[PDB]
Design a protein around this ligand. Structure first.
Ligand SMILES: Cc1cc2nc3c(=O)[nH]c(=O)nc-3n(C[C@H](O)[C@H](O)[C@H](O)COP(=O)(O)OP(=O)(O)OC[C@H]3O[C@@H](n4cnc5c(N)ncnc54)[C@H](O)[C@@H]3O)c2cc1C
Ligand SMILES: N[C@@H](CCC(=O)N[C@@H](CS)C(=O)NCC(=O)O)C(=O)O
Ligand SMILES: [Mg+2]
Length: 424
């Protein structure tokens, strides 16, 4: 029988396959494990959880909590598995990893319309196909993607800097300018405090070579950051009429301008340390960090250059990407993009046009960011409140988040209800 190809049976591919199957579209699910393992995997199971067993905070104040709720409403297999494999984790949804992957593997393998092929896919399959090969996408397939779409549009590591919410910046301590960006000028004493704090800050341990984490630049000498990302070259501080001693620059990442990254602040610091350090920067004393910096091995595509919000390749009809390969980060985000890619692939198989959830929903905010974010040096994205529209008002952050949760979940549910054919 004719089948939609799903390449990779991780978080994204498992959900993509389930979505296709639910809509009555047969699937050919390729998985190279166990005979070819990635450096992080150890089993033959679909949707193996390779690290932490947390799927994110569940609260109505948590962006991941909204995405969890949306995925339940969608009938996600990953959420079913998580709900059944739930273990205690202080506010987070966390799972017994073996019960989680076991349930997913059983439900998929037992479906009459699923064929499993245990092989490494080395070339882009023809026909309707979802690619979901993850952060450790095999070398051969990565090479195939570079050949087809361009060497510069696939990355092997992320090197993300922190991103803050624009409204949380104190603009009285910044100036907008390009050399000769938002610029946060610093005095020599402020730089010295910041540099010293970087020397001692707690950092994660690796499991890049000209891309050096800022905390490591600090360790390589007092001058290093001043020659690098904190250089004031070509800038004039309107307050002094002179070149500032040092600056931190921020650049706009999203179309809406809610999300601004610290330029050149790639980092492997622990997240609480990043927050402490960031709030030492003039203008950022009360900054809300919506995406923390990270430095790791991570194969992914330039989503804004290559993908629509539908997760279909702009220049390859009926080809889709999901999961980390598509430019997201996180087990849940990967499953959720798998759902959407599978939905659109199923619709394609049925001769129907693709869909995408609304901007108010977390999944919608995420995929719309993938399609429209700044393409230059594009880095992966996880679920956060910067991705959806604000809730206007002067209520506190907790309340705004609760309002965003309710609004988003309702918007997502209405979107689901409008789908034809419906998810049964
Ligand atoms: C070391 C490490 C730790 C992580 N820790 C966390 C964490 O704590 N929390 C979190 O939310 N996320 C974590 N992730 C990030 C990410 O959310 C997970 O990697 C998540 O599983 C991504 O889902 P995915 O479906 O995109 O990829 P995966 O789940 O990795 O699935 C990809 C699948 O494709 C297969 N494959 C690859 N190439 C081919 C090929 N050419 N042919 C056939 N099959 C192929 C792989 O064997 C794999 O089964 C971690 C990732 C890594 C690498
Ligand atoms: N990860 C992508 C995007 C580019 C990238 O990661 N650049 C780094 C170089 S050190 C960067 O500046 N990170 C900090 C930031 O994005 O501001 C790539 O390998 O092509
Ligand atoms: Mg960046």
């Amino acid at each position: 029988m004719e089948r939609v190809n799903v390449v990779g049976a991780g978080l994204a591919g498992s959900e993509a396959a389930w979505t296709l199957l639910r809509l009555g579209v047969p699937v050919r699910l390729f998985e190279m494990r166990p005979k070819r393992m990635t450096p992080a995997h150890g089993t033959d199971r679909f949707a193996e959880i390779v690290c932490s067993n947390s799927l994110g905070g569940e609260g109505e104040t948590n962006a991941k909590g909204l995405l969890q709720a949306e995925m339940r409403r969608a009938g996600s297999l990953v959420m079913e598995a998580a709900d059944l494999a739930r273990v205690p984790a202080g506010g987070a949804l966390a799972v017994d990893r073996e019960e989680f992957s076991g349930y997913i593997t059983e439900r998929l393998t037992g479906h009459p319309l699923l064929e499993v092929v245990r092989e490494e896919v080395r070339e882009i399959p023809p026909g309707i196909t979802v690619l979901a090969t993850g952060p450790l996408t095999s070398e051969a397939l990565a090479e195939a993607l570079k050949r087809r779409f361009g060497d510069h549009f696939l990355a092997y590591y992320d090197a993300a800097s922190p991103i803050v919410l624009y409204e949380s910046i104190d603009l009285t301590k910044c100036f907008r300018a390009g050399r000769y960006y938002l610029n946060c000028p610093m005095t020599e004493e402020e730089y010295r405090r910041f540099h010293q704090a970087l020397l001692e800050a707690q950092r994660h341990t690796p499991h890049f070579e000209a891309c050096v984490p800022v905390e490591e630049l600090a360790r390589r000498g007092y001058q290093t950051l001043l020659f690098g990302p904190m250089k004031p070259v070509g800038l004039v501080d309107p307050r002094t009429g002179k070149e500032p001693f040092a600056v931190v620059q921020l650049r706009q990442e999203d179309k809406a301008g809610r999300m601004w990254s610290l330029v050149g602040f790639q980092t492997g610091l622990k997240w609480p340390e990043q927050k402490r350090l960031i709030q030492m920067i003039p203008g950022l004393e009360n900054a809300e960090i919506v995406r923390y910096g990270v430095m790791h091995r991570n194969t992914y595509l330039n989503a804004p250059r290559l993908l629509g919000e539908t997760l279909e390749f702009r220049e390859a009809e009926g080809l889709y990407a999901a999961g980390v390969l598509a430019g997201v980060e996180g087990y849940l985000e990967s499953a959720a993009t798998g759902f959407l890619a599978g939905l659109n692939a199923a619709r394609k198989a049925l001769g129907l046009p693709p869909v995408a959830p609304p901007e108010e929903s977390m999944l919608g905010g995420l995929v719309r960011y993938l399609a429209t974010a700044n393409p230059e040096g594009f880095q992966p994205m996880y679920a956060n409140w910067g991705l959806v529209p604000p809730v206007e008002g002067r209520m506190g952050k907790k309340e705004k988040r609760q309002a965003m949760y309710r609004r988003g979940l309702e918007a997502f549910s209405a979107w689901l209800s409008g789908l034809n054919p419906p998810l049964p």
